[PDB]
Design a protein around this ligand. Structure first.
Ligand SMILES: CN(Cc1ccccc1)C(=O)Nc1cccc(S(N)(=O)=O)c1
Ligand SMILES: [Zn+2]
Length: 256
């Protein structure tokens, strides 16, 4: 599977029939139909003790990986019961500024989308968590092109060292708090991984406020490669799944 004409999202259901399931992601967030839920709690993002370790080009995106062997960087509150540990973040982005996000807002596509991936500590590790309907919490943050995001620059500047699939680099002491917008207002709904195996294990928490990144920052994302070293160059762009049917789900808003 990938994002090309012959192996992209429209083909995934052949290997992963859950692609046509009842709680697939991403979705379009219709802002007028989302309902304010006053029982939703503020999000608690506790990233002060985060320990980043490594950055990896996995052939579909790049992951910044964290030490998740202790409760060092955790997400709690909001719609969540219990404690969810940060394991990695990554992005999805476009070939052009007019596309790239997975979720859309009133059909608007952003230039990119950041996914901060967390697993429910009651399941012991990530591999067990993805087998559970409440196993993961993914915090999604839209990126628009405008001013630079200073806290993203350290990520941008290492990408030259992980150009191709399978390359990794040490990436310690990175603070993911520098990727957050000011407001933690959010929408939430039950969904899935947006990549094969498309497991229906995610509580999605999508922030209303985008972050701004510069044109030069996103252009550096677009220099990455899907291919391995010594294979024909295929730029890593348009690594996003389009919006899927909402089916029998309601999107809830934390804000009026
Ligand atoms: C493809 N693999 C490897 C993988 C292989 C087999 C089983 C489980 C996982 C992923 O882990 N993907 C992933 C993980 C978390 C979040 C998101 S996302 N984009 O929904 O935030 C995508
Ligand atoms: Zn993702």
């Amino acid at each position: 599977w990938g994002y090309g004409k012959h192996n992209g999202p429209e083909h995934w259901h052949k290997d992963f029939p859950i692609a046509k399931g009842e709680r697939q992601s991403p979705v379009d967030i219709d802002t007028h139909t989302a309902k304010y839920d006053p029982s939703l709690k503020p999000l608690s993002v506790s990233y002060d003790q985060a320990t980043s370790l490594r950055i990896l080009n996995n052939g579909h995106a790049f992951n910044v990986e964290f030490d998740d062997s202790q409760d060092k960087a955790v997400l709690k509150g909001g719609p969540l019961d219990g404690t969810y540990r940060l394991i990695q973040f990554h992005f999805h982005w476009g070939s052009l500024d007019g596309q790239g996000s997975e979720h859309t807002v009133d059909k608007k596509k952003y230039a990119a989308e950041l996914h901060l991936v967390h697993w429910n500590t009651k399941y012991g590790d990530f591999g067990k968590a993805v087998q559970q309907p409440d196993g993961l919490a993914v915090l999604g943050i839209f990126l628009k092109v405008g001013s630079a995001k200073p806290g993203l620059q350290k990520v941008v500047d290492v990408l030259d060292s992980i150009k191709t699939k399978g390359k990794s680099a040490d990436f310690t002491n990175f603070d993911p708090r520098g990727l957050l917008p000011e407001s933690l207002d959010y929408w939430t709904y039950p969904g899935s991984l947006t990549t094969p195996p498309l497991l229906e294990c995610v509580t999605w928490i999508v922030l209303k406020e985008p972050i701004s990144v510069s044109s030069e920052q996103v252009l550096k994302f677009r220099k990455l490669n899907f291919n391995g070293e010594g294979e024909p160059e295929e730029l890593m762009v348009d690594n996003w799944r389009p919006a899927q049917p909402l089916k029998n789900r309601q999107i809830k808003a934390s804000f009026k």
